[PDB]
Symmetry: none
Subunit: 574 residues, 2 copies
């Protein structure tokens, strides 16, 4: 019960915190294999030395990296479970390192404007992977900006937009990035910039958008998307969201600068418009949400057994907005269209399979948004010659000068080459002997010099087999004195003789038939008699012959392995 490796647990991307919770990362990998599978690991498309005492160690099937490093172990990892049958690759798992550096200590320039205008204070946050929440601080660290409708902190660029510079906005402002997500609370603030306010300018301002959203925003199904839109206007501009020829949703307020779509569906695709309006004017900005999707299987291959030289068509299909391109792998290696097998994107056609094509195959569909794998095992079924059924027959009795037919019926996956040999001597097509196509051995005019062992030898790709039989030449049961025809009247007696000879070792049985009817000489009220049976001679006496006791009589002198026969014609008539 040997089979190829089947993945049970596969790797999973991991975000490794920098603050050192543990000094080890364990990427999982595990496979069912009759002969336990050996696991190899490939980072960034290159083998990893997992020998003992190395940093990149192995525990069962799981890859353990000690003291993970963002500069050394960040990137892709792949598991290859292999065994005598073949090799299979697992999902690609990304090891990413989350962190949050601190703000550059370089002093931040101050910003100065007339009171009553709008202004922007930039955050310019430091390098960070997992994601940030941007807030702003006034003067001292504990104190926070008054969060209202006149202020808005962009949570993509971190900047701070003030629609109307108020007299109370004269002070110092710093940025604060907080990486708060599922795991991690690290938070860092920046050097304080300063906001200077000149004389007031009560002059009314038509709304002008300064926090815009991208013209093209690509997101995947199930993901969340957020659009930002904020403007400067002396009356706090009211922000409205709409969809170009779209009903939108009633539950969403759609009144704040941030439009939030959780679990973006494909229907949420399309053009969106933001409008910032105030008593003195209005401004607008538009942009498209272009929904995309990762690959997902539709049809895939399955473990299959196929006879040698068969035709096998395998197909894998996948769905995804960027049309997933499909590829094939044999034992974890690129499978190009070989001589025996044709490869065309999603179809793999084996024409006249061979024993070499068996093994582990995989179809892999990828787009710019990722990759997916599906594996299966191909078993081409061979078979050595087997004589378990239809044997050659241990004993072959014959008769002097008779014909003999000895069958040979091996069963082998590819057609078995057959040969016949008597003792140690091979046999061919002679005048007397014939080795037919089907395999039967034909011997003609047999003599006692042919007695012996005859063996059939069968072979093929896989193996060889042989079977023997004994050949025993006996005397032929023969009729020495045969009865001829006769003509007789009704009421008169007739005698048909049959003088035969046979091998003494065997008993002899005489039979008399009449137009294929068994002459019942023991019939109630019959009209026949079998003469005194000596082992050589047999006679049939018809007493009180009648018109119905005539026809083609047949004498048949048989032994338990041989028989001879003669025919006579009896005509009654008066």
């Amino acid at each position: 019960a040997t089979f190829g490796p089947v993945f049970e647990e596969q790797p999973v991307g991991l975000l490794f915190p920098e603050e050192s919770a543990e000094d080890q990362v364990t990427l999982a990998c595990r496979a069912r294999a009759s002969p336990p599978a050996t696991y190899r690991w490939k980072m960034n498309g290159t083998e990893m030395n997992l020998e003992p005492g190395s940093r990149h160690q192995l525990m069962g099937g799981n890859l353990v990296i000690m003291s993970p490093t963002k500069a050394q172990d960040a990137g892709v990892y792949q598991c290859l479970a292999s065994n005598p049958v073949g090799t299979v690759v697992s999902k690609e798992a990304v090891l990413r390192f989350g962190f949050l550096q601190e703000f550059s200590k370089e002093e931040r320039d101050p910003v100065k404007t007339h009171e009553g205008w709008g202004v922007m204070l930039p955050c310019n946050p430091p390098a960070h992977y997992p994601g940030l929440s941007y807030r702003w601080l006034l003067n001292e660290f504990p104190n926070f900006i008054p969060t209202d409708g006149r202020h808005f902190v962009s949570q993509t660029t971190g900047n701070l937009y003030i629609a109307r510079t108020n007299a109370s906005d004269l002070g110092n402002y710093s940025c604060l990035a907080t990486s708060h997500l599922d795991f991690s609370t690290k938070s860092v603030f920046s050097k304080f910039a300063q906001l200077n306010l000149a004389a007031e300018d009560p002059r009314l301002f038509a709304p002008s958008i300064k926090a815009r959203f991208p013209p093209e925003t690509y997101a995947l199904v199930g993901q969340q998307v957020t659009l930002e839109c904020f403007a400067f206007g002396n009356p706090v501009p009211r922000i409205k969201w709409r969809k170009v020829d779209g009903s939108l949703s009633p539950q969403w307020g759609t009144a704040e600068p941030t439009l939030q779509i959780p679990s973006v569906s494909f229907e949420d695709e399309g053009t969106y418009e933001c409008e910032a309006e105030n008593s003195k004017g209005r401004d607008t900005v538009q942009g498209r949400i272009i929904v995309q999707a990762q690959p997902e299987w539709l049809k895939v291959i399955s473990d299959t057994e196929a006879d040698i030289g068969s035709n096998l068509r395998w197909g894998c299909a996948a769905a995804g907005k960027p049309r997933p391109m499909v590829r094939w792998l044999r034992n974890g290696e690129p499978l190009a269209s070989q001589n025996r097998v044709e490869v065309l994107a999603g179809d793999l056609r084996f024409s006249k399979l061979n024993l070499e094509d068996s093994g582990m195959y995989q179809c892999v569909a990828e787009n710019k948004h990722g990759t997916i794998y599906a594996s299966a095992e191909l078993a081409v079924q061979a078979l050595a010659p087997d004589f378990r059924q239809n044997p050659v027959r241990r004993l072959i009795p014959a008769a002097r000068g008779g014909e003999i037919s000895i069958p040979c019926q091996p069963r082998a996956a590819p057609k078995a080459t057959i040969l016949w040999s008597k003792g140690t001597e091979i046999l061919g097509n002679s005048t007397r002997v014939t080795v037919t196509l089907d395999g039967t051995l034909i011997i003609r005019n047999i003599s006692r010099s042919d007695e012996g062992k005859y063996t059939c030898f069968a072979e093929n790709f896989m193996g060889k087999a042989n079977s023997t039989g004994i050949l025993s030449v006996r005397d032929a049961t023969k009729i020495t004195l045969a009865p001829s025809s006769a003509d007789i009247n009704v009421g008169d007696n007739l005698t048909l003789q049959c003088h035969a000879s046979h091998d003494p070792t065997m008993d002899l049985t005489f039979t008399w038939t009449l137009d294929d009817f068994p002459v019942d000489f023991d019939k109630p009220g019959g009209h026949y008699r079998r003469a005194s049976v000596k082992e050589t001679i047999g006679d049939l006496t018809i007493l009180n012959a009648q018109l119905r006791h005539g026809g083609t009589y047949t004498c048949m002198a048989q032994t338990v392995v041989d028989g001879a026969s003669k025919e006579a014609t009896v005509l009654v008539r008066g």
Copy 2:
């Protein structure tokens, strides 16, 4: 030209910031030594195996640790400068690593009490070296606890004390530590615990202090100290700070739970009391601020050369509030009171120094607040006798029948064994001649038969030396006729005679003094006369004697190498 090692640059403790600028730390160490010194390094009291390609590199004695690690290189470091003369230890420099891990992800159990009572919510902050600033959050992260006087966050344990559990205090509370140091804005908060509020208890509560300060708070002059004091009392307890018997300072508010002494002086030492008072009662807590100080030298040892078998008293003294305990080190190893040398706290007495005692010595004074070192070199001097610096009296005039003392004081490591020889014959303690203990040769009742060469032979461990001097005693200057006293009237003349004898080879000079005043016989308008000087006789004539021309006259007849003297008393009368 060879001398012991003298430290010029010494190591310095270092706080390695989290996410430093570079991944290398250079602990300085350098020593002046005529034959360049070898530098050894000791981490946590264990030798360090350094090399170029190793992590622990060396550059001019300075220790460079690449990619510093808190788990591998945190702790004490010491430099040992060694050379043929000896070994010396450097200051202890601590390499510490500042950081701030995040709170344990395990959810923290809720705390429950009766409404109107006081309560404490523990922070249990994560591992951290540098000081932290603890605040608390209510429900969500942006929102902060209202700091008003009913709440108090201990900035030593991080806990949160609520004096009166108010109906509005029912909610979720988390701790937030901010690790603000030289460069760091890191801030991490904990998973939210929950506060459960039972039925109200309107009964007033007598104040009970729960956030106390230690009875003994140890601090150094110039440092800052902070005392915390907060209590539970149903009426918001008023907190007052005072000193049991000190005028204290007006600038300090003494109204908040935290009493702050920046730059604590020695006068700020003493007992302090905090008083929490409310309508229904009062409670107090007392404790002493005990000002202390680090060790600082007062007297220390110095580089010394000492002759073999000398007595050497060394002393090192130090000042510090915990009296610094003094120890000694020989070539960087503990110097216990051995057989030859006595050690008593701050004093080290070498008795009969030997060639083995040379080397580098150090005195090390330590108290609970640190350690201080002072080094010096001890050179024990061997030396053969040398007379180049103090040769023997090359010329020795004396007087017939007089006593002669000829010193012999060579410069030798151990005192030189001395012998005296005239010509080729050695001298001992005879009736006239004696070879004294100090080494001086004493000759008595000398005659012209002793004139000749006298040589001192000195020896010691190392070598032998000798030096000669001529002895030329020719005759004793003697007074044959001495003047006696006299009594005279004013206006009359007096004559004081002095008849002397001298060796013919030398001239003779007469001197007349009057009560240690040189009788000026060439005085403008004087009243003296020195008679006609013959080489044998000298007379002083006082003409027109006066009350001021009397007293103890002294005749002094001298040659340039010998002299005799006599004294008379002249009494004038009016």
